[model samples]
Target: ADCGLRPLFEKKSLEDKTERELLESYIIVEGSDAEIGMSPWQVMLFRKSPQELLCGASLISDRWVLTAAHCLLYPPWDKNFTENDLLVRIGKHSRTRYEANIEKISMLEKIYIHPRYNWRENLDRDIALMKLKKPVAFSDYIHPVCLPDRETAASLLQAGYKGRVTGWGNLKETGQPSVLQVVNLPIVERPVCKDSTRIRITDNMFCAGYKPDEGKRGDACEGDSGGPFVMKSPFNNRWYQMGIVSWGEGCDRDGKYGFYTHVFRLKKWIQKVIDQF
Candidate 1:
């Protein structure tokens, strides 16, 4: 038995379809939560030093971004560093248009780690939050998504509801992720997933996707960590942020499904932390 399950991919015969048609129909969609019909949130890129590599941050509010804590844990955190290290980009499509240093991230207001995080397991607390130096003005295209509530937990693994995941992480092993990448998969049950993996799909976890390799449509892969897994409420036609990308054996394997940190399970913890700050 392999440590990681191979995805059950749908085999298609390309004899009839041309490469151009395939590409035209198969390009991935890239955008912020609002652009993807979620919430309009601001994002920015930051350099490691005076100027170095860049990383993306989501606008949780005018002043904060819901990002991974590890992103800010780089060495040499200078006393003078705060929001200045960040360069906010609003409606920016490329580096040239990105409005630089529009906002500076204050010190990380808080970093809440899942209690179960085990460095030996290589699964650290998979969440973090950024408190912005100044409040931002919300606009038509900039808004926040509601965090999922208790009711969200019961329905998350329902067979038909779509849980969409998105990111700009690497597409190929060494390739840069697109400015964005998005894919959709229906939620799968915990029992079924656990039977498939024999690993605990704990209360902290939720599973999403069809049997791997069975179809071209599956779940997230490498480098997509910390991106969102969002679900829509048909009644109100509103969206909720449900999951945070976590660990899995592989991208899309036959019996192995993609797993994520369920936001619903951490509702009390998140609210308490936010309220404390």
Candidate 2:
């Protein structure tokens, strides 16, 4: 009966955990510890056979996950794959080290990729949802993130706000970090991002990261796809996901920016699919 109307923004427990001190054991790329209990909605998508991490994802409801469609459609998509081939891990930050927390893996019941999704060309409508075999019990270290409506997303975009991107993506072309990484990057306007010659910035995609003026580089890289680009809600101060880590030329490359699936533009589609299920 999850209608996707959960009020996660007003939760005091999550607010309190956000204030905790960073745990020093983890390693992030130009970013710091994600704080032990901060982003409970973050999840890792994995293939069970070899026990390998494939992509990052966010919990949107007790039984659902929001991720990039490309994650599930890339080469070797395994046309004959079944639900048991996928595993959704929740409430764990370190990819290797086992932390004492509410870490659990949910079996996938089904996957719903946007019908018009195109990975070969524009990458338009690159979004998808995963239904779990059973609903996960919400906890301080496991919860769903809020999804913003069009109006709220527009305001945030207009404000030229910065959002945090987190994942256990590659730290460099040759290395992948075991601990979750996070960085605060500014959202690039659609008009400004359209100037890039490298890739087409479409209505379904929005850009974020460094501009020439900004000295530092912060971005989501490989292994980061299907993750979240989340922003704090101006009206409530709670975090609402704005985009999904989609694609980019390279990790933190100068003059190049990271592109994400525009969650705002696909909000209605997301709701419709969830409602139907």
Give the number of the best model, judged by TM-score.
2
Which pairs of residues have clashing backbones in candidate 2?
none
RMSD of each: 10.8, 5.1
Off by over 4 Å in 2: 1-29, 75-81
Index of the highest-lDDT prediction: 2
lDDT of 1 by residue, 164-202 (tens): 666555443324432445566667767886787756557
The whole-model C-alpha lDDT of candidate 1 against the native structure comes to 0.50
Query: Given candidate 2, what's the lDDT at residue 205?
Result: 86
Worst 10 residues of 1 by lDDT: 1-10
Off by over 4 Å in 1: 1-39, 42-47, 50-58, 68-110, 114-116, 122-125
- Candidate 2 lDDT by residue in tens digits, 108-221: 999988888886686788899999999998876777778878666766654246777888888764467767777777777677777764566688888887787768777888
TM-score of 2: 0.87
